[PDB]
Write a protein that binds this DNA or RNA. Sequence first.
RNA 1: ACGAGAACUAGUAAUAAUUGUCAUUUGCAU
Lengths: 205, 199, 205, 117, 117, 102
Amino acid sequence: YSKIKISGTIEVVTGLHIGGGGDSPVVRDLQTKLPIIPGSSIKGKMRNLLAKHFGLKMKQESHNQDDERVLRLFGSSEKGNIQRARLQISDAFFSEKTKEHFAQNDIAYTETKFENTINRLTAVANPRQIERVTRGSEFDFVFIYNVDEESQVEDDFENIEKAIHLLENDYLGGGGTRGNGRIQFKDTNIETVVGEYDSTNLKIK
Amino acid sequence: YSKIKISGTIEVVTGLHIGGGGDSPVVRDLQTKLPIIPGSSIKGKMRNLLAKHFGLKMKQESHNQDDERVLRLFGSSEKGNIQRARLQISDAFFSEKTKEHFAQNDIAYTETKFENTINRLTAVANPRQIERVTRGSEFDFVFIYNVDEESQVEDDFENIEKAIHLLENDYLGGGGTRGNGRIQFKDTNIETVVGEYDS
Amino acid sequence: YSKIKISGTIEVVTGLHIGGGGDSPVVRDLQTKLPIIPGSSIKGKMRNLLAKHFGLKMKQESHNQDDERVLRLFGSSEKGNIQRARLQISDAFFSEKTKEHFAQNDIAYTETKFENTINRLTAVANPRQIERVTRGSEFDFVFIYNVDEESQVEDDFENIEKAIHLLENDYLGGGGTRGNGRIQFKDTNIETVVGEYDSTNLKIK
Amino acid sequence: MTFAHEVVKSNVKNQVLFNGLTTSKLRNLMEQVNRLYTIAFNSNEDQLNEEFIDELEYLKIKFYYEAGREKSVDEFLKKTLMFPIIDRVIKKESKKFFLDYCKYFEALVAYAKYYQK
Amino acid sequence: MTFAHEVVKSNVKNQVLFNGLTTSKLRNLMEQVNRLYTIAFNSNEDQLNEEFIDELEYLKIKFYYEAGREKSVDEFLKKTLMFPIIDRVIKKESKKFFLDYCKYFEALVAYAKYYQK
Amino acid sequence: AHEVVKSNVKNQVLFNGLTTSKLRNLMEQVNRLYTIFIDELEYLKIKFYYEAGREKSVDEFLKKTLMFPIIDRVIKKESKKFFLDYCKYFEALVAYAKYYQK
RNA sequence: ACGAGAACUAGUAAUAAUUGUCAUUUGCAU
């Protein structure tokens, strides 16, 4: 029984707009009043993509019962099966380097972006204001892996690196079709924090 | 499941004004203090121009129901049917060589235009200002295509080809009517990144 | 017969949801109206994870008969070989330092993060809202350990060290896999409150 | 002033409530009210903090802002005598009256939440 | 205090507001004040850093710019004593007074928004 | 910054009738340099001489601000931060000139 | 020299488990 940690950083490529708290604000902490990326968002997005990579039928689309191996990786424990999740995602917090960088370059943390709609056969605009996390900021994450069994660890991290690649070419957040939500991953670190397992041959791109 | 990236570079030919922040400024990244082309604007020109290039009924205009091809290629999910976007368009930024080329030659990124007003029967001259993005600068975009059905990929790519064709011959941003927005595309590159698809 | 008191503070890293009330509110004292961590939560999570550390067979899964020494530490007293419990885990209460902190800087004691669910074949979202304890909160805990057998103090504190360390890499409450409820222990203390036993050689990270 | 608590049933017209009020549009107000209810409840004495007086001022500010944003909230606040009672609670500065307002407001919120589309 | 309250009712004339003030005309000022709010909140000590003093100086510059741009904003700033208040805030160099100013200005804006065409 | 502009209001005219339309090209110069080199600062100096030549009031403006010594000391210092500080000062002067007008 | 006197309603276990605040909509007509 051991736990393998994954640490890293999300780079904000273009704008990011979670906005669970909402003119139309974004999700923010309250101890620092600096934005965060909720872990539920990351987990849901990766689960959706990695499910879509494997098989997905209409009857399978019915009630969120997914392919057996993704189920193993993220846990269902619903269909009379013993499956607690094996991969834990935490939140991401607006990092110290980012704060110092934006302080010493005098750039704000949030952009307020104005949007319009042009009505058909009407040509009249109704404006909107959408607030998004500024580009180039970095958030840090930590993941936890549990080894419920020894002989699926390599395969599970193969799945996770596939998923991370898919995220690197997808959007996380809101309105990602209209040009905000691309992210990248840097500085992956792999340690076995508790246990007697080796973290040298294992890698994530 | 697979994704095929489309990468390329757009060149502005005439004046350019996006002016989302609007004496009348232009959209800009705060992290670079440099102008941009927000993906929303490109998406809007696309949807309008492609719907017009297809059937655009007055009743369909009233009810905002769009043509099935255009809708699948850009997603609506407004009529109670599931329709997720199959094509996502991102922001776009200056490329490096443009930055260098303007840095060396003592060229700015903005041109301020006086528009002189002459009023009928009175001809009272009140000058106005508008800001523009310097012609000859090129922006770098990425389009990300999501593949859901292995056969109609080709048709969707062809529709994107007519997409770019129309957009080149029309105007993007503001002042499209008065001579502002004519941009062209170069160095398009296609490269499947995830999956085992031959593209 | 001596008793050793263990004291410290729990610092919330990411929002915590014990929330035994079920909208979806958190457990609160009825004299202060502030969130609490029931001691049953600490005891149960330590029980479970330190059990899953050692051997846990299917036949062991069936009966809640667990490893002999985890059982010794936490007591079974169910069938046959009875063992009275030995470590008493108390509740944790919202500290006065953090109370002054959040009162002064005008920070809420609870956030209501809104979450969503994208079901398949329909993509129709159905929202939900969850209360979570704000990070930077500090809870004050007390443990009491009874020395029923003198020679076993070292092993027992070794195992509780294992428990603390493993808990710091896990969650309390719900939504643990969704980001919620990671804790750290800080400013620990060991002192002999009753008896004639020295507690200088003792440490808990 | 309890007729102001049961006016909510007198305002079920034809069907929308308070002309389309939803409790969802009351969320910021509910959050602030809960915050200062907890803070007041922990307080010992009846005499409120001067900073707590400023807090109540911030309550009126937020009430006016919400009444400005939405018309249904505006009707709810105006006709149920919310503004005068807020001023009055600010005037007496006693804890028990602030709790009395809190119970009235919570009763309003719950009873309104009973009926929603 | 809430001089904002009775001032906003003193500026309702015949209807124009501050000779036609509208909420769209204060967006930039609201943004700048919000950013200074969050930066100062991030600060620990009460003594204002010289960099935050320079932020206050640029904020004063921006009030003056906007007041030169439009006449109604000029009348609003002039009668609401924004300029004297900012000068005193810069003189005091205390964070708590800056937050109090933030609350005042927020109340001003909220009233201006609740009374609109 | 404020002090000079508020105190150069003589009897009402500002710097004997200064109006920002006369400062357009200088404003564009400062904005272009703000976006971004010693020689660029040199031609910058030259353009203050240029616009101060176009109108007498502008020459008096650049004199009563001590613009020329400030720019010389900027070019000596060659530090990016201090040039941006100069941009802030120039922007403040322009804003206060805009406020105090006919 | 009281139908008395001895006598812990005690021991074992938590609010858990899967759920993305999303899906479309040109800062637009001089």
